[PDB]
């Protein structure tokens, strides 16, 4: 049952990968807004970062169900 | 035949997504207390960060059992 | 009997997971380098970098998902 | 014979929970280090964060083997 092994395991590496690509975009945004906080140090920019991360996990939550 | 492959793969993708988003809920706290230590330079908030990552991680470990 | 197959298969599941997460960790570690750069210096040129770097990380990740 | 699937799912659930906790450890290390370079902006901490990130990725590299 190697067709089973091959199909299943190659497809799986694919999905782990894609999901990562997404958690990476998000993280990216977290990093850029975080850099903005670094440059300015603004409770404002921090509430911004909060709202972002919140919409990001809103997105993930969404996707994880399907 | 293939219908079983289908079912297994989907449950797999889901599991990934669940685990990832749980990580993202964690990354969240980590980012925001990080932004705090950015803004106030707190040695106390440094401790708060260390403490919170410690416990967050332990709460990560306790899922793998099962 | 069955247990043999099952074992091998889970094994390579854990394998592919380990490999892809080490890749994400390499991306993240670059991210941390330029981010700390911003911490110590606070030059915005560095924010232009960081943008470019995240972008090419997610770029290559899309590129890998496309086997 | 769905019980095959049953075992397989529990196992993978496990496997992934675990791989994520191993990466999370090194992130925590990197966050301890980053917070301390925030307080004290020393190239010392800089080069030393490089070293730790390094230990982590290689630990995980050999691990795939």
PDB file of C-alpha atoms in Angstrom:
ATOM      1  CA  UNK A   1       0.000   0.000   0.000  1.00  0.00           C
ATOM      2  CA  UNK A   2       2.685   2.497  -0.999  1.00  0.00           C
ATOM      3  CA  UNK A   3       0.238   4.489  -3.137  1.00  0.00           C
ATOM      4  CA  UNK A   4      -1.465   4.990   0.220  1.00  0.00           C
ATOM      5  CA  UNK A   5       1.820   5.929   1.896  1.00  0.00           C
ATOM      6  CA  UNK A   6       2.915   8.280  -0.913  1.00  0.00           C
ATOM      7  CA  UNK A   7      -0.353  10.072  -1.616  1.00  0.00           C
ATOM      8  CA  UNK A   8      -1.238  10.472   2.029  1.00  0.00           C
ATOM      9  CA  UNK A   9       2.178  11.611   3.277  1.00  0.00           C
ATOM     10  CA  UNK A  10       3.018  14.006   0.402  1.00  0.00           C
ATOM     11  CA  UNK A  11      -0.438  15.611   0.692  1.00  0.00           C
ATOM     12  CA  UNK A  12       0.088  15.943   4.464  1.00  0.00           C
ATOM     13  CA  UNK A  13       3.421  17.714   4.113  1.00  0.00           C
ATOM     14  CA  UNK A  14       1.519  19.990   1.734  1.00  0.00           C
ATOM     15  CA  UNK A  15      -1.180  20.877   4.290  1.00  0.00           C
ATOM     16  CA  UNK A  16       1.117  21.390   7.272  1.00  0.00           C
ATOM     17  CA  UNK A  17       3.020  23.670   4.878  1.00  0.00           C
ATOM     18  CA  UNK A  18       0.027  25.752   3.709  1.00  0.00           C
ATOM     19  CA  UNK A  19      -1.363  26.230   7.189  1.00  0.00           C
ATOM     20  CA  UNK A  20       2.105  27.403   8.174  1.00  0.00           C
ATOM     21  CA  UNK A  21       2.162  29.878   5.265  1.00  0.00           C
ATOM     22  CA  UNK A  22      -0.963  31.407   6.739  1.00  0.00           C
ATOM     23  CA  UNK A  23       0.193  31.530  10.370  1.00  0.00           C
ATOM     24  CA  UNK A  24       3.261  33.192   8.941  1.00  0.00           C
ATOM     25  CA  UNK A  25       1.436  36.003   7.169  1.00  0.00           C
ATOM     26  CA  UNK A  26      -0.367  36.702  10.387  1.00  0.00           C
ATOM     27  CA  UNK A  27       2.759  36.637  12.443  1.00  0.00           C
ATOM     28  CA  UNK A  28       4.211  38.990   9.905  1.00  0.00           C
ATOM     29  CA  UNK A  29       1.581  41.565  10.597  1.00  0.00           C
ATOM     30  CA  UNK A  30       2.187  41.057  14.289  1.00  0.00           C
ATOM     31  CA  UNK A  31       5.850  41.741  13.702  1.00  0.00           C
ATOM     32  CA  UNK A  32       5.385  44.885  11.631  1.00  0.00           C
ATOM     33  CA  UNK A  33       2.890  46.443  14.062  1.00  0.00           C
ATOM     34  CA  UNK A  34       5.255  45.358  16.825  1.00  0.00           C
ATOM     35  CA  UNK A  35       8.082  47.206  15.093  1.00  0.00           C
ATOM     36  CA  UNK A  36       5.856  50.267  14.976  1.00  0.00           C
ATOM     37  CA  UNK A  37       5.443  50.025  18.769  1.00  0.00           C
ATOM     38  CA  UNK A  38       9.242  49.746  19.008  1.00  0.00           C
ATOM     39  CA  UNK A  39       9.800  52.919  17.018  1.00  0.00           C
ATOM     40  CA  UNK A  40       7.043  54.972  18.707  1.00  0.00           C
ATOM     41  CA  UNK A  41       6.181  53.229  22.043  1.00  0.00           C
ATOM     42  CA  UNK A  42       2.488  54.178  21.887  1.00  0.00           C
ATOM     43  CA  UNK A  43      -0.308  52.636  24.000  1.00  0.00           C
ATOM     44  CA  UNK A  44      -2.294  53.606  20.929  1.00  0.00           C
ATOM     45  CA  UNK A  45      -0.209  51.456  18.585  1.00  0.00           C
ATOM     46  CA  UNK A  46      -0.525  48.725  21.215  1.00  0.00           C
ATOM     47  CA  UNK A  47      -4.316  48.820  21.134  1.00  0.00           C
ATOM     48  CA  UNK A  48      -3.832  48.657  17.387  1.00  0.00           C
ATOM     49  CA  UNK A  49      -1.682  45.532  17.715  1.00  0.00           C
ATOM     50  CA  UNK A  50      -4.317  44.087  19.993  1.00  0.00           C
ATOM     51  CA  UNK A  51      -7.155  44.620  17.524  1.00  0.00           C
ATOM     52  CA  UNK A  52      -4.966  43.105  14.832  1.00  0.00           C
ATOM     53  CA  UNK A  53      -4.037  39.933  16.638  1.00  0.00           C
ATOM     54  CA  UNK A  54      -7.702  39.700  17.497  1.00  0.00           C
ATOM     55  CA  UNK A  55      -8.826  39.745  13.881  1.00  0.00           C
ATOM     56  CA  UNK A  56      -5.958  37.333  13.097  1.00  0.00           C
ATOM     57  CA  UNK A  57      -7.112  34.710  15.558  1.00  0.00           C
ATOM     58  CA  UNK A  58     -10.714  35.451  14.451  1.00  0.00           C
ATOM     59  CA  UNK A  59      -9.478  34.454  10.959  1.00  0.00           C
ATOM     60  CA  UNK A  60      -7.691  31.347  12.240  1.00  0.00           C
ATOM     61  CA  UNK A  61     -10.616  30.224  14.363  1.00  0.00           C
ATOM     62  CA  UNK A  62     -12.754  30.542  11.315  1.00  0.00           C
ATOM     63  CA  UNK A  63     -10.406  28.501   9.169  1.00  0.00           C
ATOM     64  CA  UNK A  64      -9.659  25.775  11.757  1.00  0.00           C
ATOM     65  CA  UNK A  65     -13.315  24.751  11.863  1.00  0.00           C
ATOM     66  CA  UNK A  66     -14.422  24.469   8.214  1.00  0.00           C
TER      67      UNK A  66
ATOM     68  CA  UNK B   1     -10.986   2.650  -1.379  1.00  0.00           C
ATOM     69  CA  UNK B   2     -10.287   6.392  -1.460  1.00  0.00           C
ATOM     70  CA  UNK B   3     -13.194   7.695   0.686  1.00  0.00           C
ATOM     71  CA  UNK B   4     -11.278   6.597   3.773  1.00  0.00           C
ATOM     72  CA  UNK B   5      -8.174   8.504   2.615  1.00  0.00           C
ATOM     73  CA  UNK B   6     -10.469  11.522   2.281  1.00  0.00           C
ATOM     74  CA  UNK B   7     -11.848  11.305   5.820  1.00  0.00           C
ATOM     75  CA  UNK B   8      -8.435  10.777   7.444  1.00  0.00           C
ATOM     76  CA  UNK B   9      -6.751  13.637   5.581  1.00  0.00           C
ATOM     77  CA  UNK B  10      -9.473  16.120   6.527  1.00  0.00           C
ATOM     78  CA  UNK B  11      -9.403  15.256  10.197  1.00  0.00           C
ATOM     79  CA  UNK B  12      -5.635  15.771   9.898  1.00  0.00           C
ATOM     80  CA  UNK B  13      -5.884  19.270   8.422  1.00  0.00           C
ATOM     81  CA  UNK B  14      -8.340  20.173  11.160  1.00  0.00           C
ATOM     82  CA  UNK B  15      -6.042  18.930  13.954  1.00  0.00           C
ATOM     83  CA  UNK B  16      -3.216  21.054  12.607  1.00  0.00           C
ATOM     84  CA  UNK B  17      -5.449  24.145  12.468  1.00  0.00           C
ATOM     85  CA  UNK B  18      -6.655  23.570  16.053  1.00  0.00           C
ATOM     86  CA  UNK B  19      -3.143  23.198  17.446  1.00  0.00           C
ATOM     87  CA  UNK B  20      -1.850  26.170  15.501  1.00  0.00           C
ATOM     88  CA  UNK B  21      -4.610  28.545  16.651  1.00  0.00           C
ATOM     89  CA  UNK B  22      -4.025  27.467  20.233  1.00  0.00           C
ATOM     90  CA  UNK B  23      -0.412  28.456  19.690  1.00  0.00           C
ATOM     91  CA  UNK B  24      -1.667  31.732  18.307  1.00  0.00           C
ATOM     92  CA  UNK B  25      -3.717  32.499  21.397  1.00  0.00           C
ATOM     93  CA  UNK B  26      -0.418  31.974  23.246  1.00  0.00           C
ATOM     94  CA  UNK B  27       1.768  34.037  20.914  1.00  0.00           C
ATOM     95  CA  UNK B  28      -0.840  36.724  21.531  1.00  0.00           C
ATOM     96  CA  UNK B  29      -0.202  37.266  25.223  1.00  0.00           C
ATOM     97  CA  UNK B  30       3.504  36.924  24.460  1.00  0.00           C
ATOM     98  CA  UNK B  31       3.385  39.753  21.887  1.00  0.00           C
ATOM     99  CA  UNK B  32       1.371  42.128  24.029  1.00  0.00           C
ATOM    100  CA  UNK B  33       3.382  41.786  27.260  1.00  0.00           C
ATOM    101  CA  UNK B  34       6.337  42.158  24.950  1.00  0.00           C
ATOM    102  CA  UNK B  35       4.911  45.469  23.718  1.00  0.00           C
ATOM    103  CA  UNK B  36       4.475  46.509  27.363  1.00  0.00           C
ATOM    104  CA  UNK B  37       8.107  45.801  28.191  1.00  0.00           C
ATOM    105  CA  UNK B  38       8.812  47.780  25.004  1.00  0.00           C
ATOM    106  CA  UNK B  39       6.948  50.824  26.254  1.00  0.00           C
ATOM    107  CA  UNK B  40       7.777  50.907  29.979  1.00  0.00           C
ATOM    108  CA  UNK B  41      11.165  49.071  30.155  1.00  0.00           C
ATOM    109  CA  UNK B  42       9.808  47.175  33.135  1.00  0.00           C
ATOM    110  CA  UNK B  43      12.017  44.644  34.865  1.00  0.00           C
ATOM    111  CA  UNK B  44       8.766  43.631  36.567  1.00  0.00           C
ATOM    112  CA  UNK B  45       7.032  43.125  33.254  1.00  0.00           C
ATOM    113  CA  UNK B  46      10.056  41.140  32.132  1.00  0.00           C
ATOM    114  CA  UNK B  47       9.338  38.858  35.032  1.00  0.00           C
ATOM    115  CA  UNK B  48       5.667  38.859  34.109  1.00  0.00           C
ATOM    116  CA  UNK B  49       6.649  37.701  30.640  1.00  0.00           C
ATOM    117  CA  UNK B  50       8.884  34.951  31.939  1.00  0.00           C
ATOM    118  CA  UNK B  51       6.223  33.730  34.352  1.00  0.00           C
ATOM    119  CA  UNK B  52       3.508  33.789  31.730  1.00  0.00           C
ATOM    120  CA  UNK B  53       5.464  31.945  29.088  1.00  0.00           C
ATOM    121  CA  UNK B  54       6.420  29.317  31.664  1.00  0.00           C
ATOM    122  CA  UNK B  55       2.779  28.640  32.532  1.00  0.00           C
ATOM    123  CA  UNK B  56       1.593  28.943  28.972  1.00  0.00           C
ATOM    124  CA  UNK B  57       4.061  26.325  27.935  1.00  0.00           C
ATOM    125  CA  UNK B  58       3.083  23.970  30.760  1.00  0.00           C
ATOM    126  CA  UNK B  59      -0.532  24.350  29.617  1.00  0.00           C
ATOM    127  CA  UNK B  60       0.778  23.472  26.136  1.00  0.00           C
ATOM    128  CA  UNK B  61       2.412  20.303  27.472  1.00  0.00           C
ATOM    129  CA  UNK B  62      -0.704  19.069  29.270  1.00  0.00           C
ATOM    130  CA  UNK B  63      -2.579  18.677  25.958  1.00  0.00           C
ATOM    131  CA  UNK B  64      -0.163  16.149  24.465  1.00  0.00           C
ATOM    132  CA  UNK B  65      -1.127  13.600  27.109  1.00  0.00           C
ATOM    133  CA  UNK B  66      -3.872  11.555  25.411  1.00  0.00           C
TER     134      UNK B  66
ATOM    135  CA  UNK C   1       0.530  -7.126  11.107  1.00  0.00           C
ATOM    136  CA  UNK C   2      -1.326  -3.804  10.754  1.00  0.00           C
ATOM    137  CA  UNK C   3       0.784  -2.244  13.457  1.00  0.00           C
ATOM    138  CA  UNK C   4       3.892  -2.199  11.244  1.00  0.00           C
ATOM    139  CA  UNK C   5       2.338   0.000   8.554  1.00  0.00           C
ATOM    140  CA  UNK C   6       0.666   2.356  11.063  1.00  0.00           C
ATOM    141  CA  UNK C   7       3.986   2.856  12.827  1.00  0.00           C
ATOM    142  CA  UNK C   8       5.989   3.711   9.711  1.00  0.00           C
ATOM    143  CA  UNK C   9       3.266   6.069   8.634  1.00  0.00           C
ATOM    144  CA  UNK C  10       2.997   8.032  11.876  1.00  0.00           C
ATOM    145  CA  UNK C  11       6.765   8.164  11.849  1.00  0.00           C
ATOM    146  CA  UNK C  12       6.882  10.048   8.564  1.00  0.00           C
ATOM    147  CA  UNK C  13       4.030  12.278   9.806  1.00  0.00           C
ATOM    148  CA  UNK C  14       6.170  13.376  12.708  1.00  0.00           C
ATOM    149  CA  UNK C  15       9.105  13.672  10.262  1.00  0.00           C
ATOM    150  CA  UNK C  16       7.377  16.063   7.878  1.00  0.00           C
ATOM    151  CA  UNK C  17       6.085  18.076  10.848  1.00  0.00           C
ATOM    152  CA  UNK C  18       9.619  18.407  12.305  1.00  0.00           C
ATOM    153  CA  UNK C  19      11.135  19.408   8.976  1.00  0.00           C
ATOM    154  CA  UNK C  20       8.569  22.077   8.150  1.00  0.00           C
ATOM    155  CA  UNK C  21       8.690  23.574  11.630  1.00  0.00           C
ATOM    156  CA  UNK C  22      12.506  23.813  11.462  1.00  0.00           C
ATOM    157  CA  UNK C  23      11.995  25.796   8.244  1.00  0.00           C
ATOM    158  CA  UNK C  24       9.502  28.178   9.905  1.00  0.00           C
ATOM    159  CA  UNK C  25      11.993  28.536  12.742  1.00  0.00           C
ATOM    160  CA  UNK C  26      14.702  29.598  10.348  1.00  0.00           C
ATOM    161  CA  UNK C  27      12.368  32.269   8.956  1.00  0.00           C
ATOM    162  CA  UNK C  28      11.422  33.413  12.430  1.00  0.00           C
ATOM    163  CA  UNK C  29      15.058  33.551  13.524  1.00  0.00           C
ATOM    164  CA  UNK C  30      15.918  35.957  10.724  1.00  0.00           C
ATOM    165  CA  UNK C  31      12.841  37.949  11.765  1.00  0.00           C
ATOM    166  CA  UNK C  32      14.202  38.174  15.268  1.00  0.00           C
ATOM    167  CA  UNK C  33      17.595  39.398  14.060  1.00  0.00           C
ATOM    168  CA  UNK C  34      16.241  42.383  12.144  1.00  0.00           C
ATOM    169  CA  UNK C  35      13.646  43.059  14.854  1.00  0.00           C
ATOM    170  CA  UNK C  36      16.340  43.328  17.538  1.00  0.00           C
ATOM    171  CA  UNK C  37      18.227  45.490  15.078  1.00  0.00           C
ATOM    172  CA  UNK C  38      15.271  47.868  15.292  1.00  0.00           C
ATOM    173  CA  UNK C  39      15.245  47.585  19.104  1.00  0.00           C
ATOM    174  CA  UNK C  40      18.831  48.727  19.460  1.00  0.00           C
ATOM    175  CA  UNK C  41      18.964  51.236  16.619  1.00  0.00           C
ATOM    176  CA  UNK C  42      15.384  52.237  15.790  1.00  0.00           C
ATOM    177  CA  UNK C  43      16.185  52.974  12.140  1.00  0.00           C
ATOM    178  CA  UNK C  44      13.175  52.762   9.837  1.00  0.00           C
ATOM    179  CA  UNK C  45      15.280  51.502   6.963  1.00  0.00           C
ATOM    180  CA  UNK C  46      15.171  48.417   9.154  1.00  0.00           C
ATOM    181  CA  UNK C  47      11.403  48.417   9.000  1.00  0.00           C
ATOM    182  CA  UNK C  48      11.656  48.445   5.211  1.00  0.00           C
ATOM    183  CA  UNK C  49      13.933  45.455   5.538  1.00  0.00           C
ATOM    184  CA  UNK C  50      11.645  43.616   7.893  1.00  0.00           C
ATOM    185  CA  UNK C  51       8.751  44.140   5.512  1.00  0.00           C
ATOM    186  CA  UNK C  52      10.816  42.777   2.605  1.00  0.00           C
ATOM    187  CA  UNK C  53      11.973  39.832   4.724  1.00  0.00           C
ATOM    188  CA  UNK C  54       8.562  38.688   5.960  1.00  0.00           C
ATOM    189  CA  UNK C  55       7.374  39.012   2.393  1.00  0.00           C
ATOM    190  CA  UNK C  56      10.042  36.786   0.948  1.00  0.00           C
ATOM    191  CA  UNK C  57       9.549  34.270   3.775  1.00  0.00           C
ATOM    192  CA  UNK C  58       5.837  33.918   2.974  1.00  0.00           C
ATOM    193  CA  UNK C  59       6.826  33.997  -0.719  1.00  0.00           C
ATOM    194  CA  UNK C  60       9.047  30.947  -0.375  1.00  0.00           C
ATOM    195  CA  UNK C  61       6.451  29.198   1.776  1.00  0.00           C
ATOM    196  CA  UNK C  62       3.836  29.555  -0.939  1.00  0.00           C
ATOM    197  CA  UNK C  63       6.564  28.296  -3.312  1.00  0.00           C
ATOM    198  CA  UNK C  64       7.108  25.140  -1.217  1.00  0.00           C
ATOM    199  CA  UNK C  65       3.407  24.396  -0.862  1.00  0.00           C
ATOM    200  CA  UNK C  66       3.448  24.271  -4.691  1.00  0.00           C
ATOM    201  CA  UNK C  67       5.258  20.968  -5.164  1.00  0.00           C
TER     202      UNK C  67
ATOM    203  CA  UNK D   1     -12.127  -1.225  10.648  1.00  0.00           C
ATOM    204  CA  UNK D   2     -12.435   2.473  11.460  1.00  0.00           C
ATOM    205  CA  UNK D   3     -10.627   1.822  14.750  1.00  0.00           C
ATOM    206  CA  UNK D   4      -7.465   2.005  12.632  1.00  0.00           C
ATOM    207  CA  UNK D   5      -8.406   5.619  11.902  1.00  0.00           C
ATOM    208  CA  UNK D   6      -9.268   6.117  15.580  1.00  0.00           C
ATOM    209  CA  UNK D   7      -5.746   5.204  16.779  1.00  0.00           C
ATOM    210  CA  UNK D   8      -4.177   7.099  13.910  1.00  0.00           C
ATOM    211  CA  UNK D   9      -6.044  10.309  14.789  1.00  0.00           C
ATOM    212  CA  UNK D  10      -5.212  10.199  18.489  1.00  0.00           C
ATOM    213  CA  UNK D  11      -1.566   9.616  17.572  1.00  0.00           C
ATOM    214  CA  UNK D  12      -1.327  12.540  15.179  1.00  0.00           C
ATOM    215  CA  UNK D  13      -3.209  14.857  17.551  1.00  0.00           C
ATOM    216  CA  UNK D  14      -0.488  13.941  20.009  1.00  0.00           C
ATOM    217  CA  UNK D  15       2.373  14.313  17.540  1.00  0.00           C
ATOM    218  CA  UNK D  16       1.375  17.826  16.591  1.00  0.00           C
ATOM    219  CA  UNK D  17       0.612  19.054  20.135  1.00  0.00           C
ATOM    220  CA  UNK D  18       4.113  17.909  20.933  1.00  0.00           C
ATOM    221  CA  UNK D  19       6.064  19.366  18.038  1.00  0.00           C
ATOM    222  CA  UNK D  20       4.418  22.716  18.833  1.00  0.00           C
ATOM    223  CA  UNK D  21       5.421  22.541  22.497  1.00  0.00           C
ATOM    224  CA  UNK D  22       9.051  21.839  21.489  1.00  0.00           C
ATOM    225  CA  UNK D  23       9.184  24.877  19.246  1.00  0.00           C
ATOM    226  CA  UNK D  24       7.438  26.986  21.914  1.00  0.00           C
ATOM    227  CA  UNK D  25      10.281  26.236  24.363  1.00  0.00           C
ATOM    228  CA  UNK D  26      12.849  27.873  22.110  1.00  0.00           C
ATOM    229  CA  UNK D  27      10.606  30.774  21.399  1.00  0.00           C
ATOM    230  CA  UNK D  28      10.331  31.368  25.111  1.00  0.00           C
ATOM    231  CA  UNK D  29      14.107  31.323  25.324  1.00  0.00           C
ATOM    232  CA  UNK D  30      14.215  33.889  22.511  1.00  0.00           C
ATOM    233  CA  UNK D  31      11.658  36.070  24.285  1.00  0.00           C
ATOM    234  CA  UNK D  32      13.608  36.075  27.577  1.00  0.00           C
ATOM    235  CA  UNK D  33      16.581  37.208  25.518  1.00  0.00           C
ATOM    236  CA  UNK D  34      14.667  39.838  23.515  1.00  0.00           C
ATOM    237  CA  UNK D  35      13.144  41.428  26.614  1.00  0.00           C
ATOM    238  CA  UNK D  36      16.590  41.689  28.153  1.00  0.00           C
ATOM    239  CA  UNK D  37      17.964  43.380  25.003  1.00  0.00           C
ATOM    240  CA  UNK D  38      15.018  45.783  25.197  1.00  0.00           C
ATOM    241  CA  UNK D  39      16.017  46.837  28.696  1.00  0.00           C
ATOM    242  CA  UNK D  40      19.739  46.859  27.914  1.00  0.00           C
ATOM    243  CA  UNK D  41      20.561  47.557  24.270  1.00  0.00           C
ATOM    244  CA  UNK D  42      23.919  45.730  24.149  1.00  0.00           C
ATOM    245  CA  UNK D  43      25.393  44.024  21.086  1.00  0.00           C
ATOM    246  CA  UNK D  44      26.428  41.412  23.649  1.00  0.00           C
ATOM    247  CA  UNK D  45      22.807  40.353  24.004  1.00  0.00           C
ATOM    248  CA  UNK D  46      22.517  40.603  20.238  1.00  0.00           C
ATOM    249  CA  UNK D  47      25.246  38.124  19.348  1.00  0.00           C
ATOM    250  CA  UNK D  48      24.075  35.978  22.211  1.00  0.00           C
ATOM    251  CA  UNK D  49      20.515  35.811  20.893  1.00  0.00           C
ATOM    252  CA  UNK D  50      22.037  34.624  17.628  1.00  0.00           C
ATOM    253  CA  UNK D  51      23.830  31.813  19.474  1.00  0.00           C
ATOM    254  CA  UNK D  52      20.652  30.666  21.261  1.00  0.00           C
ATOM    255  CA  UNK D  53      18.454  30.732  18.160  1.00  0.00           C
ATOM    256  CA  UNK D  54      21.230  28.645  16.624  1.00  0.00           C
ATOM    257  CA  UNK D  55      21.233  25.954  19.373  1.00  0.00           C
ATOM    258  CA  UNK D  56      17.481  25.745  18.951  1.00  0.00           C
ATOM    259  CA  UNK D  57      17.284  25.310  15.188  1.00  0.00           C
ATOM    260  CA  UNK D  58      20.020  22.643  15.150  1.00  0.00           C
ATOM    261  CA  UNK D  59      18.503  20.788  18.082  1.00  0.00           C
ATOM    262  CA  UNK D  60      15.355  20.657  15.948  1.00  0.00           C
ATOM    263  CA  UNK D  61      17.356  19.811  12.817  1.00  0.00           C
ATOM    264  CA  UNK D  62      18.969  16.625  14.157  1.00  0.00           C
ATOM    265  CA  UNK D  63      15.565  15.930  15.678  1.00  0.00           C
ATOM    266  CA  UNK D  64      13.932  15.393  12.277  1.00  0.00           C
ATOM    267  CA  UNK D  65      16.439  12.462  12.041  1.00  0.00           C
TER     268      UNK D  65
END
